[PDB]
Scaffold this active site. Sequence first.
Site, PDB file in Angstrom:
ATOM      1  N   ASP A  25       0.862  -1.099  -0.179  1.00 22.32           N
ATOM      2  CA  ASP A  25      -0.111  -0.125  -0.126  1.00 22.32           C
ATOM      3  C   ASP A  25       0.722   1.398  -0.108  1.00 22.32           C
ATOM      4  O   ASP A  25       1.323   1.565   1.119  1.00 22.32           O
ATOM      5  CB  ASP A  25      -0.757  -0.020   1.275  1.00 22.32           C
ATOM      6  CG  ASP A  25      -2.251   1.001   0.996  1.00 22.32           C
ATOM      7  OD1 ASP A  25      -2.089   1.907   0.292  1.00 22.32           O
ATOM      8  OD2 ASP A  25      -2.938   0.563   1.835  1.00 22.32           O
ATOM      9  N   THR A  26       0.943   1.903  -1.087  1.00 20.74           N
ATOM     10  CA  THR A  26       1.554   3.192  -1.280  1.00 20.74           C
ATOM     11  C   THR A  26       0.742   4.295  -0.665  1.00 20.74           C
ATOM     12  O   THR A  26       1.617   5.480  -0.470  1.00 20.74           O
ATOM     13  CB  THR A  26       1.766   3.526  -2.571  1.00 20.74           C
ATOM     14  OG1 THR A  26       0.808   3.633  -3.454  1.00 20.74           O
ATOM     15  CG2 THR A  26       2.887   2.306  -3.393  1.00 20.74           C
ATOM     16  N   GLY A  27      -0.223   4.249  -0.407  1.00 22.36           N
ATOM     17  CA  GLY A  27      -1.259   5.229   0.079  1.00 22.36           C
ATOM     18  C   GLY A  27      -1.381   5.230   1.512  1.00 22.36           C
ATOM     19  O   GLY A  27      -2.108   5.863   2.382  1.00 22.36           O
TER      20      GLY A  27
HETATM   21  C1  LIG Z   1      -3.270   8.783   8.183  1.00 21.96           C
HETATM   22  C2  LIG Z   1      -2.064   8.063   8.044  1.00 21.96           C
HETATM   23  C3  LIG Z   1      -2.342   7.008   6.941  1.00 21.96           C
HETATM   24  O1  LIG Z   1      -1.619   6.961   5.690  1.00 21.96           O
HETATM   25  N1  LIG Z   1      -3.245   5.909   7.432  1.00 21.96           N
HETATM   26  C4  LIG Z   1      -3.505   4.778   6.354  1.00 21.96           C
HETATM   27  C5  LIG Z   1      -4.480   4.812   5.554  1.00 21.96           C
HETATM   28  O2  LIG Z   1      -5.483   4.691   5.649  1.00 21.96           O
HETATM   29  N2  LIG Z   1      -4.580   5.363   4.153  1.00 21.96           N
HETATM   30  C6  LIG Z   1      -5.530   5.555   3.190  1.00 21.96           C
HETATM   31  C7  LIG Z   1      -5.337   7.117   2.522  1.00 21.96           C
HETATM   32  C8  LIG Z   1      -5.132   8.159   3.498  1.00 21.96           C
HETATM   33  C9  LIG Z   1      -4.043   8.888   3.751  1.00 21.96           C
HETATM   34  C10 LIG Z   1      -4.024   9.716   4.632  1.00 21.96           C
HETATM   35  C11 LIG Z   1      -4.990  10.166   5.436  1.00 21.96           C
HETATM   36  O3  LIG Z   1      -4.871  11.013   6.518  1.00 21.96           O
HETATM   37  C12 LIG Z   1      -6.179   9.265   5.114  1.00 21.96           C
HETATM   38  C13 LIG Z   1      -6.224   8.498   4.400  1.00 21.96           C
HETATM   39  C14 LIG Z   1      -5.396   4.400   2.132  1.00 21.96           C
HETATM   40  O4  LIG Z   1      -6.402   4.740   1.025  1.00 21.96           O
HETATM   41  C15 LIG Z   1      -5.260   3.025   2.663  1.00 21.96           C
HETATM   42  N3  LIG Z   1      -5.401   2.196   1.550  1.00 21.96           N
HETATM   43  C16 LIG Z   1      -6.365   0.932   1.510  1.00 21.96           C
HETATM   44  C17 LIG Z   1      -6.089   0.103   2.517  1.00 21.96           C
HETATM   45  C18 LIG Z   1      -7.358  -0.988   2.784  1.00 21.96           C
HETATM   46  C19 LIG Z   1      -7.294  -2.081   1.873  1.00 21.96           C
HETATM   47  C20 LIG Z   1      -8.493  -2.836   1.769  1.00 21.96           C
HETATM   48  C21 LIG Z   1      -9.572  -2.807   2.784  1.00 21.96           C
HETATM   49  C22 LIG Z   1      -9.530  -1.680   3.731  1.00 21.96           C
HETATM   50  C23 LIG Z   1      -8.253  -0.945   3.660  1.00 21.96           C
HETATM   51  O5  LIG Z   1     -10.573  -3.530   2.873  1.00 21.96           O
HETATM   52  C24 LIG Z   1     -11.046  -3.976   1.731  1.00 21.96           C
HETATM   53  C25 LIG Z   1     -12.215  -3.028   1.194  1.00 21.96           C
HETATM   54  C26 LIG Z   1     -11.896  -2.176   0.008  1.00 21.96           C
HETATM   55  N4  LIG Z   1     -11.463  -0.833   0.255  1.00 21.96           N
HETATM   56  C27 LIG Z   1     -10.516  -0.197  -0.308  1.00 21.96           C
HETATM   57  O6  LIG Z   1      -9.907  -0.574  -1.406  1.00 21.96           O
HETATM   58  C28 LIG Z   1      -9.914   1.143   0.274  1.00 21.96           C
HETATM   59  C29 LIG Z   1     -10.139   2.406  -0.582  1.00 21.96           C
HETATM   60  C30 LIG Z   1     -11.706   2.212  -0.962  1.00 21.96           C
HETATM   61  C31 LIG Z   1      -9.896   3.572   0.054  1.00 21.96           C
HETATM   62  C32 LIG Z   1     -10.023   4.876  -0.781  1.00 21.96           C
HETATM   63  N5  LIG Z   1      -8.509   0.951   0.399  1.00 21.96           N
HETATM   64  C33 LIG Z   1      -7.695   1.304   1.434  1.00 21.96           C
HETATM   65  O7  LIG Z   1      -8.617   1.978   2.406  1.00 21.96           O
HETATM   66  C34 LIG Z   1      -3.457   3.632   7.118  1.00 21.96           C
HETATM   67  C35 LIG Z   1      -3.677   2.358   6.505  1.00 21.96           C
HETATM   68  C36 LIG Z   1      -2.186   3.302   8.217  1.00 21.96           C
END
Ligand SMILES: CCC(=O)N[C@H](C(=O)N[C@@H](Cc1ccc(O)cc1)[C@H](O)CN[C@H]1Cc2ccc(cc2)OCCCNC(=O)[C@H]([C@@H](C)CC)NC1=O)C(C)C
Lengths: 99, 99
Positions: A25-27
């Site tokens: 995860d790059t995000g």
């Molecule tokens: C704030 C510090 C930070 O970077 N936090 C991270 C974060 O949530 N980063 C998200 C972006 C972000 C950046 C800064 C900030 O202040 C707030 C949010 C990033 O989007 C996480 N990437 C994925 C991780 C994930 C993957 C699958 C998941 C749940 C989580 O369940 C499957 C269900 C599908 N979910 C997804 O694909 C989501 C999309 C929808 C997010 C946009 N993906 C993420 O959240 C966590 C993982 C330590």
Amino acid sequence: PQITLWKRPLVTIRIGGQLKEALLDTGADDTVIEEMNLPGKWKPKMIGGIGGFIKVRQYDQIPVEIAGHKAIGTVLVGPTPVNIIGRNLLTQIGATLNF
Amino acid sequence: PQITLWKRPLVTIRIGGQLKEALLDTGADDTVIEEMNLPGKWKPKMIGGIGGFIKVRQYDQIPVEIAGHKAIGTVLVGPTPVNIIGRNLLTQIGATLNF
Ligand SMILES: CCC(=O)N[C@H](C(=O)N[C@@H](Cc1ccc(O)cc1)[C@H](O)CN[C@H]1Cc2ccc(cc2)OCCCNC(=O)[C@H]([C@@H](C)CC)NC1=O)C(C)C
């Protein structure tokens, strides 16, 4: 390895002597692993994401093998839907985004 | 180009005639843009991440230029702290993870 994003970039990692699947995860600033027993002391911490904040256990200087590549850093253990390898460990293995 | 992960992979995108800064996220299945008045029909939906689920509006076939690279696909609009470019659009610009 050059990984394409047609499918979720999932890879096998070894942590605490156990193999697990994890999302590159790059995000993600940090590495968040699903609830598990990790040797060593831990401190309580809160991290935010989409949906909100959750409580995690912060383990420092933990060795993690990502696709055969070694990394030693901070791993947060908590209620996450999927094991996530963030930039803190991705930078250790020389991971870059290319297009 | 090659983007190192020392800092968050933020790039300039163009959507709905506007220029925004977005995060290249290989861990996101979908593309999520901060609240904005995008014209067109939409469908309600819920996406989940770390802290839970958020309600968003799904817009299909939205033109989005990423770092000068043209793409077109589904964009979700909702209360997000940061603009996220997910794999749905990353694949279209030929983005890969390399290490
Ligand atoms: C704030 C510090 C930070 O970077 N936090 C991270 C974060 O949530 N980063 C998200 C972006 C972000 C950046 C800064 C900030 O202040 C707030 C949010 C990033 O989007 C996480 N990437 C994925 C991780 C994930 C993957 C699958 C998941 C749940 C989580 O369940 C499957 C269900 C599908 N979910 C997804 O694909 C989501 C999309 C929808 C997010 C946009 N993906 C993420 O959240 C966590 C993982 C330590």
